[PDB]
């Protein structure tokens, strides 16, 4: 997600610079018009008033398109990430015999995973429910799916935690630190 931030911040440098050419231009536009009648003083303002309206609109598409690509990029990984751990905390599973804390290592990376995909997903709709609200209110329904299915999918893994209940047993406190 560094590379995010520092996209992020990048966009807002040049969004900051565009829009101080911009004040200056308009600047120099008034001056370089004081000579001049007051419907052609009042069409400069207008026109200087719709530059920065278009440049805030071009900044409002490079954020969105900034963060549309980093969540697919992020869901990619995050996925991956998710799926090789299920593997080693359900081959740890299988293990003869079963290791409680080798278990219990690969059962955390895979709630961690979990939880990884879970915060950031809640994290960017909260952003966007704080900002714009009724645009929240569009995909509200998408991300409340995306999330119950894995709270859905953890819960199943975990579930399958008691299909070794000696080693359930020995972790289960451990496991409940993960949890809380």
């Given at each position: 997600?560094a590379h995010?931030q520092?996209?992020?911040?990048?966009?807002?440098a040049?969004?900051?610079?565009?829009?101080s050419?911009?004040?200056?231009?308009?600047?120099?536009?008034?001056?370089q018009a004081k000579?001049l009648?007051?419907?052609?003083?009042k069409a400069?303002?207008?026109?200087?008033?719709?530059?920065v309206?278009?440049?805030?609109q071009?900044?409002?598409?490079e954020?969105?398109?900034?963060?549309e690509?980093?969540?697919?990029?992020?869901e990619?990984m995050?996925?991956?990430r998710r799926?090789?751990?299920?593997?080693?905390?359900?081959?740890?599973l299988?293990?003869?015999?079963?290791?409680?804390?080798?278990?219990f290592n690969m059962?955390?990376k895979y709630v961690?995973?979990?939880?990884?995909?879970?915060q950031?997903?809640?994290?960017?709709?909260?952003h966007?429910?704080?900002v714009?609200?009724?645009?929240?209110?569009?995909?509200?329904?998408?991300?409340?799916?995306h999330l119950?299915?894995?709270?859905?999918?953890?819960?199943?893994?975990?579930?399958?935690l008691?299909?070794?209940p000696?080693?359930?047993?020995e972790?289960?406190?451990?496991v409940?630190?993960?949890?809380?």
């Amino acid at each position: 997600h560094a590379h995010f931030q520092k996209a992020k911040e990048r966009l807002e440098a040049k969004h900051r610079e565009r829009m101080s050419q911009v004040m200056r231009e308009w600047e120099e536009a008034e001056r370089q018009a004081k000579n001049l009648p007051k419907a052609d003083k009042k069409a400069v303002i207008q026109h200087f008033q719709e530059k920065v309206e278009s440049l805030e609109q071009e900044a409002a598409n490079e954020r969105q398109q900034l963060v549309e690509t980093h969540m697919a990029r992020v869901e990619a990984m995050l996925n991956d990430r998710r799926r090789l751990a299920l593997e080693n905390y359900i081959t740890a599973l299988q293990a003869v015999p079963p290791r409680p804390r080798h278990v219990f290592n690969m059962l955390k990376k895979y709630v961690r995973a979990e939880q990884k995909d879970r915060q950031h997903t809640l994290k960017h709709f909260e952003h966007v429910r704080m900002v714009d609200p009724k645009k929240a209110a569009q995909i509200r329904s998408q991300v409340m799916t995306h999330l119950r299915v894995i709270y859905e999918r953890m819960n199943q893994s975990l579930s399958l935690l008691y299909n070794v209940p000696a080693v359930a047993e020995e972790i289960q406190d451990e496991v409940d630190e993960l949890l809380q």
